Symmetry: C2
Subunit: 187 residues, 2 copies
């Protein structure tokens, strides 16, 4: 069967950090569901790009567990994710079932807000470090992509490809990741 990914899209989400992983994972044969936090309506991203989610988080949630739950960054988007009880439940369940959780940029602060994976080595956008480290519940890393067990984090728009490919490797293996990477014309 094909692995499945849940991407939670909220207003203020960084559109590059949303689209790059969605696109790359789909190139990997992963069944991706772009779930709107607020509902089924179009989401206005941080730089005003408007994306239409495949479904509402409420409905997507009802579609069994996913092999990975992806949290895009963007300050306002991360704040929305952090204040959502629905998101809290989803991450709690994913962590409990030992499923992968991937967050990029300011996205990881949602993990702190919902007390997810405390003790994990994580990274975030440089400007989100202080917020993420409030209380010292995680150990900080400057690696472009950081994967501590089932907690995978990344730094920003510029690390989106590395972040996406790391998720692909975790779900479908190194061979698939390399196959998907070549046509992208990356480094």
């Amino acid at each position: 069967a094909s692995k499945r990914a849940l991407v939670i899209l909220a207003k203020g989400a960084e559109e590059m950090e949303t689209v790059i992983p969605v696109d790359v994972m789909r190139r990997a044969g992963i069944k991706v569901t772009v779930a709107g936090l607020a509902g089924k309506d179009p989401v206005q991203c941080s730089r005003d790009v408007v994306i239409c989610p495949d479904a509402s988080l409420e409905d997507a949630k009802k579609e069994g567990p996913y092999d990975v739950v992806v949290l895009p960054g963007g300050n306002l988007g991360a704040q929305n994710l952090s204040e959502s009880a629905a998101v809290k439940e989803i991450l709690k369940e994913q962590e409990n079932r030992k499923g992968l959780i991937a967050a990029i940029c300011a996205g990881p602060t949602a993990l702190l807000a919902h007390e997810i994976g405390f003790g994990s080595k994580v990274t975030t956008h440089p400007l989100a470090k202080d917020k993420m480290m409030n209380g010292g519940h995680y150990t900080y890393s400057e690696n472009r992509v950081e994967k501590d067990g089932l907690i995978l984090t990344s730094r920003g728009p510029g690390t989106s490809f590395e972040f996406a490919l790391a998720i692909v490797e975790a779900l479908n293996g190194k061979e698939v990741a390399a196959q998907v990477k070549a046509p992208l014309v990356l480094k």
Copy 2:
């Protein structure tokens, strides 16, 4: 005043090649208009990401000339751009007025279809080279970003950031490009 950019969005367009330049240019203070080729309705991109254009190409066109006309890639999207008479007129006018034209991935083949900038040194996605070189109307380059005068081209999803930053430098200068680049956490 602020520079203005026209991004032409067609069905099948590569969403990463569309969103990255739009986002980066907006970070640069450039007024960007995402114009839908088919109309004002949402556009289904190559990897099914659905983007809502700011306006129709027909209406965007009526909004005077732009400092840059951007053509995203994606095979099906490039084909749509190449078959559009509206696009032909827009590029002809931009070239005539000596305005910048930027195309990435398969996007440059739209230039060939509309006989734009013949004789220019250009690059495209590796798989689009043969189509672009039919007739030998351009000279090929393997540079990740190629800028020959007012014709700026790039190779693929993985060169999108370099492509966008090149456009920013061309419109607003090196200082602004560097300022916009730092927060992205690129190479």
